[PDB]
């Protein structure tokens, strides 16, 4: 939850 991959 909450993650950013980028």
């Known amino acids: 939850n909450y993650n ?3």
């Open 4 to 6: 950013n991959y980028q």
